[model samples]
Target: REKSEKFAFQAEVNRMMKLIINSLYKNKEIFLRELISNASDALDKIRLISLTDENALAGNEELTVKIKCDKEKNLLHVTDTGVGMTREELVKNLTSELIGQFGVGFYSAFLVADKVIVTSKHNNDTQHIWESDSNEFSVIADPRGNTLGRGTTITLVLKEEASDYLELDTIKNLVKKYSQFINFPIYVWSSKGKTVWDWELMN
Candidate 1:
């Protein structure tokens, strides 16, 4: 197969991009829930696979979601120890809206973030990291080592107007509103005393 080529949007498409960015996503926090829901879907996939292949859950047995906030860095990270996507899957899924040809959920992160970073590791392939800042995106093999044997992590650098998303309550309410029905558990990383803590599902 030939290396994938990058294409630029048409003039009219480019002109309407800003309008789509501003008017398309009504709630900035909704992106978090969408990402978490996507993570839950990945976990569900792995769980179904484990039902037949015992080794599927070898490294991580507890399937859950985690959200980490970094106020100083203006970053919000969501992660899950679930089946990850390959490079091709990441590129295809992250680049285009295939399901309904509507729009890309990954790009919705740009609605709140100036930059987005995604790190993923799959059992059948090497780990990879994808980075983007609205206008462009690039993917590369993981360099920080595969801390997650199998899973994915997404980091968003909060934009000036969307900084409210970094708050705990904001994220909590957002998750409850959109992903309360998600199959797997969702957790938010918290720091309490000496040990790191996790705020698990409430409802």
Candidate 2:
């Protein structure tokens, strides 16, 4: 109804976040696993839907997962050409009990990121942004509009302790260990030389 809005996380979500953050303190690397798995699931959904409805993909057919990082900015990005969420879905599905078992995995993001920003564009709705810092979350109509075409890009503002997650090598190893069997190609931006980079397929 509004261009921008904010909402408190459901009590269970907040409680679950605490459990996830504490329980996974030793295995923070699993954040990458959860994220990659979620991306693959979204991709699978779109592919399955498209088999029955030719336009389900809405022209965005690439199904792959890409990871990038900016050391200076302390940012890590996971981009997927998969089924994205609408504005209502961004709020209700992500924050409410209707999360389709995607809840726990998504909460693991808080293990490494002080803040998480999800930019998504679904075929049936305009691009929108869902942002949260664990305590609360917000949703807004993306001003850039349709940037992803049809998918989601999750940006993590990493905590200082989690800065290692930004390292290309670290990401590669994590993907190799946790998501090697994933159906989609996983790519991480690899450093070639000073100021040179390329997406290196990790698995």
Q: After superposition, how far is residue 102 of candidate 1 from its true place, in Å?
A: 5.1
In model 2, pairs of residues that clash are none
Instruction: Specify the highest-lDDT model's number.
Output: 2
Q: What is the alpha-carbon lDDT for the whole of candidate 1?
A: 0.72
RMSD after Cα superposition, model 1: 4.3
The sequence of per-residue lDDT tens digits that candidate 2 reaches over residues 36-135 is 8889988998888889998887658789898888887889999999989989889987422222255577778888899999999988899999999999
Query: Can you list the residue pairs that collide in candidate 1?
Result: none
Model 1: residue 10 alpha-carbon error in angstroms: 10
Model 1 per-residue lDDT tens digits across residues 31-116? 76568767887899999998999899876677888877777789899888899878876675631233113544555677888898
Worst 10 residues of 2 by lDDT: 94-103
**Where does candidate 1 stray beyond 4 Å?**
1-22, 94-103, 192-196
Which residues of candidate 2, in runs, are more than 4 Å off?
A: 1-4, 95-103, 192-197
What shift in Å separates residue 143 of candidate 1 from its native position after superposition? 1.2
**Lowest summed lDDT window (length 10), candidate 1:** 94-103
